[PDB]
Amino acid sequence: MVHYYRLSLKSRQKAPKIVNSKYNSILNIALKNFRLCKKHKTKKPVQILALLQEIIPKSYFGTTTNLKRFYKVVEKILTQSSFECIHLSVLHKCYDYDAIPWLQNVEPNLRPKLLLKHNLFLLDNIVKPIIAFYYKPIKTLNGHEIKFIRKEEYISFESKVFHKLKKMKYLVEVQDEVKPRGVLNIIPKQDNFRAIVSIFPDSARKPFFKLLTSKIYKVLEEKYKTSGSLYTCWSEFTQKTQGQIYGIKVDIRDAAGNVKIPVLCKLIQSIPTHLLDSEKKNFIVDHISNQFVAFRRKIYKWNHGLLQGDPLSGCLCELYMAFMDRLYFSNLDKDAFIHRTVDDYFFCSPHPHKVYDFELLIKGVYQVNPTKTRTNLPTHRHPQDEIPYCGKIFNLTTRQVRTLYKLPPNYEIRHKFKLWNFNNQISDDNPARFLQKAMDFPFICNSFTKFEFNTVFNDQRTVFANFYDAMICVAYKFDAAMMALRTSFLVNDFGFIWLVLSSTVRAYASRAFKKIVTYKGGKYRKVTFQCLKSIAWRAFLAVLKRRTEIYKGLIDRIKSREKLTMKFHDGEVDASYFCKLPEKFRFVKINRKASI
DNA sequence: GGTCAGGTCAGGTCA
Ligand SMILES: [Mg+2]
Ligand SMILES: [Mg+2]
């Protein structure tokens, strides 16, 4: 009942020098080259595809089509997403066994299972180890994107920042022996960095760690007035204000790093004893006061704010900022709007000067990221009407809000979707259950909420454009799933495809109708059940056009019937946006080629 | 057969 192979590197093994008796000795040639490959003869430019072809003799596959079949899996590995899998069946089905010389002696009908396991051996003992030798997998944290960087480069970057973190005395060799709680990792996040700790497993302590986090969060609801729902505060404020809205979003930089431990410790002691007893208080106090981290066989003490990667740090920083909240935001004009996520602040008022004062206040209290500041203030260098905050885009002039989409140029959109589940596996003969589990609604549910479908402050044009953008996303996921179906299910029967799509469009439109009818507003005109379906269908249409030759049947299929009459009772909807693909998603890369 | 709360999972969002 195990049908999956995981692409991730940690599954790898450490190659024996010789292959055992149950495997054919040709493997050892490969292994030989492994040592020779190991020889420090590498320069900056290597291609893993290229070096592998000089490690595994072509005589192992015999024919070029077999070799290409195998290297296309290798290429998938080299371009992999986190959690991604393939079907074990891929490793043996459709190979030309006649042309493989070392497989002729054994009778043909017992041959397939052997070949799968032999290819598994090569992938686990030579391919993955060779990838590990020159590269480190890091999760970009934008979807499941994984970028590989040269080990020499990652180590150099990690040494540079280690020394910088040493000159500023953030890190100090402890020398007094102390049990370290975890290992430091330096993770790049664009121009800046993220220094985090991976905690050594401390079994039975995560019940304890969840308990302490829970009890503090209860304290943070109970003593400090909840920030409000982000949606409701903004709703009330939009109704309040009929004039031009003014606003600012600021991003505090290293909010954990700018925590003053003495003040936090005093907040701890100041907690009432009925909420959190003195023993737990004292356990927490030397916990944040004695942060010990293991580097290259050496232990250091972190003495700058809260350490990311600590179980308590996420929740603890919120308490500090929550306390800062009351310290500095008790008096605010109730004709104004304010909301905070954790280290991001969004503030709006009808008066420009009061927004300016808020900006000066925050800069006076905190070191901020000036590049991350967005404002409609006129006196600012690069002012904008669109403020991104908490996954959404707010237009202060129009009051319209759109979903925010994190698609950098050349981002590969298949990294956004986690299509493989190792815990519940689907057999290679069952593609339909796979595709429909892929199209479960819950996954896009976070773009099917009151925020995008309300008509209280949102126009019908923007509720449509939101639904469209989301449906564009669902189309891109369909595409990735289809490409998965061709390359590992090796499906030939596309007749059953044209079915769940419309079953989903119907159900999705119905769910939309429900939400839109649930949140009618003063800007709500009239929305036809069928019009939503037409929008969804036009979204799929716009997407499917990227790979026309593969889908020309399907596009033609939906071309007839499937009503797209975009004659909505509004007399304003441009409708050009709906017809084609928004520029954000025209420039994103769907194909797959092994770069390095 | 009709609810419920409780428990688990799932793919997603935010920081
Ligand atoms: Mg966990
Ligand atoms: Mg938990």
Numbering used by the authors: 1 to 596
Task: Copy out sentences from the published article reporting this entry, exactly as the authors wrote them.
Second, the ribonucleoprotein telomerase elongates shortened telomeres at chromosomal ends using a reverse transcriptase activity. Although the human telomerase holoenzyme is composed of multiple accessory subunits, catalysis is localized to the telomerase reverse transcriptase (TERT) subunit. We found that, in terms of global protein structure, minimal rearrangement is required to proceed through the catalytic cycle.
